[PDB]
Amino acid sequence: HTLVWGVWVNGVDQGDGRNIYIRSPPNNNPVKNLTSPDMTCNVDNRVVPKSVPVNAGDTLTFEWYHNTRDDDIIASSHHGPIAVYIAPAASNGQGNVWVKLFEDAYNVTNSTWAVDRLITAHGQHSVVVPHVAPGDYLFRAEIIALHEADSLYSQNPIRGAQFYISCAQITINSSDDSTPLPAGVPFPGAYTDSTPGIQFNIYTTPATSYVAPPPSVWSGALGGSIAQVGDASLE
Ligand SMILES: OC[C@H]1O[C@@H](O[C@H]2[C@H](O)[C@@H](O)[C@H](O[C@H]3[C@H](O)[C@@H](O)[C@H](O)O[C@@H]3CO)O[C@@H]2CO)[C@H](O)[C@@H](O)[C@@H]1O
Numbered sequence: 001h002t003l004v005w006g007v008w009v010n011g012v013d014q015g016d017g018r019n020i021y022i023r024s025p026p027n028n029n030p031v032k033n034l035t036s037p038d039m040t041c042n043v044d045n046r047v048v049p050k051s052v053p054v055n056a057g058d059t060l061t062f063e064w065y066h067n068t069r070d071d072d073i074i075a076s077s078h079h080g081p082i083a084v085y086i087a088p089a090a091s092n093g094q095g096n097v098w099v100k101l102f103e104d105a106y107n108v109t110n111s112t113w114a115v116d117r118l119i120t121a122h123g124q125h126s127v128v129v130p131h132v133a134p135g136d137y138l139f140r141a142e143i144i145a146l147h148e149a150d151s152l153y154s155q156n157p158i159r160g161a162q163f164y165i166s167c168a169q170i171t172i173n174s175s176d177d178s179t180p181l182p183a184g185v186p187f188p189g190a191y192t193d194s195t196p197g198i199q200f201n202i203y204t205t206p207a208t209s210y211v212a213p214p215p216s217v218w219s220g221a222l223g224g225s226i227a228q229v230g231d232a233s234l235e
Pocket residue numbers: 001028066067074075077078147
């Protein structure tokens with residue numbers, strides 16, 4: 001159970017974005033139904049009044065939290081990967097529009113899942129804004145908690161992989177459009193019951209065998225990291 005509080009741009013806090021520039025759901029409950037429209041931008045997908053201005057090459061940092069800002073972030077039970085996707089805002093996340101900018105599953109040298117590292121990073125993870133067409137975009141941050149993912153939701157609706165999905169409204173202002181945005185995948189639709197990474201047993205299968213759900217990260221993506229960039233406590 002986790003939610004996005006807001007974002008930072010180039011290490012600068014853009015302020016509380018809940019229902020402002022984040023299409024926030026009413027609570028931190030997971031989405032589990034892979035076929036539901038809730039997969040796109042969670043359960044209250046609507047236009048919110050603000051969209052955060054950034055330029056290509058900026059660092060955009062999502063900040064997550066559990067109950068209050070900079071708290072335990074997400075229960076440490078919730079081991080799993082983290083991905084960020086982008087689509088143009090005009091799609092409203094419909095269609096084959098979602099392009100992967102970032103993927104982190106398990107780090108063998110540190111022996112930590114992306115979620116493990118997100119807690120250490122005080123809820124913060126980032127992507128570098130790509131050289132896509134200027135315009136309005138949705139950035140869809142997705143955490144998959146795998147602690148009940150030995151079952152499939154479709155088969156047993158009290159279990160299954162859990163998706164903590166948050167869509168940020170982001171306006172790319174300065175960009176040369178030198179890496180125009182390629183074809184995307186649909187959410188819902190990209191993840192199905194046979195998709196690698198959706199059904200997995202973290203308690204018996206080595207984490208080093210884990211493979212995250214495709215698609216693979218776009219070659220045009222400029223980078224990203226799970227790491228604290230700013231200190232909320234001074235805010
Ligand atoms: O059910 C067994 C699993 O529980 C996991 O904990 C979650 C609880 O199941 C869930 O009810 C609780 O939801 C809270 C939420 O955390 C809180 O922020 C919100 O205000 O109220 C919700 C309840 O209405 O979330 C916790 C996770 O934080 C365990 O992590 C898991 O190991 C366990 O097997």
